[PDB]
């Protein structure tokens, strides 16, 4: 019978990811200072 050698499947393997993926998130900074200062002024009152 014919050979069997554990070759890769026909059509190649799928696309592997290797690049960096660190997704941006969070608020705009303006909003964070605003929330802090609002809580601060409310607590002062």
């Amino acid at each position: 019978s014919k050979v069997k050698q554990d070759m890769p499947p026909p059509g190649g393997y799928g696309p592997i990811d290797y690049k960096r993926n660190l997704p941006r998130r969070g608020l705009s900074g303006y909003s964070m200072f605003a929330v802090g200062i609002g809580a601060l002024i409310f607590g002062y009152w």
Partner: protein
């Protein structure tokens, strides 16, 4: 080819928005809450640990552990004192001494392995032209003394008479690769 890892293109763009963003990176520990959330994410994952004596890590038929001397299905001793397993053993762990068995057969009167010299490399089992000595599956033969790890013909034949049900099957899997 190549590529830079810690090289910005260049500088000289700033606005109040970017300054506020960097100043809220500072003063709020923004890039540290990310690591905190990472470790929190790991808190809620199924851990990879296993109850060892009950559930055990996966091994292969090629796995080489304890040593054992095998027989034919007739119960005949399979080694023939050809003494190349000791010739190639790169730690000089194997001493062999032979005689005619009084049946006129080539057999060993001696087969020792200092298992504190064996590097568990498998050269002996891939050199034995009869598949007499193998390197069995076992990895749970820790002892309280050095003398127990100085084997002889009887201990190896006992390991063979013990693990043949596993050795024969793993060989059944692993030949056609060798």
């Amino acid at each position: 080819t190549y590529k830079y890892v810690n090289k910005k293109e260049q500088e000289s763009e700033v606005d109040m928005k970017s300054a506020t963003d960097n100043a809220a990176r500072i003063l709020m520990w923004t890039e540290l809450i990310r690591g905190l959330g990472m470790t929190l994410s790991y808190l809620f994952r199924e851990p990879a640990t296993i109850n060892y004596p009950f559930e055990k890590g996966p091994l292969s038929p090629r796995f080489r552990g304890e040593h054992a001397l095998r027989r034919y299905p007739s119960g005949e001793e399979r080694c023939i004192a050809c003494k190349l397993c000791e010739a190639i053993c790169p730690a000089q762990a194997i001493t062999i001494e032979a005689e005619p068995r009084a049946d006129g057969s080539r057999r060993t009167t001696r087969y020792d392995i200092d298992m504190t010299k064996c590097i568990y490399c498998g050269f002996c089992q891939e050199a034995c032209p009869v598949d007499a000595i193998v390197e069995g599956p076992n990895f749970e033969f820790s002892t309280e003394t050095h003398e127990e790890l100085l084997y002889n013909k009887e201990k190896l034949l006992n390991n063979g008479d013990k693990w043949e049900a596993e050795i024969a099957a793993n060989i059944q899997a692993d030949y056609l690769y060798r």
